[PDB]
Chain length 85, copies 2
């Protein structure tokens, strides 16, 4: 394999790793938002609860975007390995 | 702030902090995708370029969701401080 092909193979593997790491992080963050939401609902805090529920929708969007990225990162790694692995 | 209020405020701070950590990693990840693209365009591997460009789209989408999450998280933390901090 050429130095360059080998380089691109390794870049793809690194992107896949970082994608995995970010996805886990997004899962933990959603959990934290859920937790906070439960507490604010118990606190009779309607205006805080309202923004906490919009924040939970954003945490869902973030976890979803991370998962979508990871799917394509795996696909790119697969394709690189097929060619150059 | 009552103890439970102060707890919700700490939970918001921790959500803010993790949001900042995630945004930073999504910036890094997009840089990696950009650098791979440069390399794949160079190797004239158009199928690989096609995957990488799709991944480029997803990296921007992911970084955008992390930025939007962080904006909302900071706004919630700041309201929580207004009430309880
Ligand atoms: Ni896609």
């Amino acid at each position: 394999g050429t130095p360059e092909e080998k380089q691109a193979l390794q870049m793809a593997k690194q992107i896949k790793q970082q994608a995995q790491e970010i996805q886990k992080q997004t899962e933990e963050l959603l959990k934290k938002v859920q937790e906070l939401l439960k507490k604010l609902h118990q606190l009779g805090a309607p205006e805080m609860a309202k923004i906490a529920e919009e924040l939970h929708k954003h945490a869902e969007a973030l976890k979803q975007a991370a998962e979508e990225f990871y799917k394509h990162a795996e696909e790119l790694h697969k394709a690189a390995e097929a060619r150059w692995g």
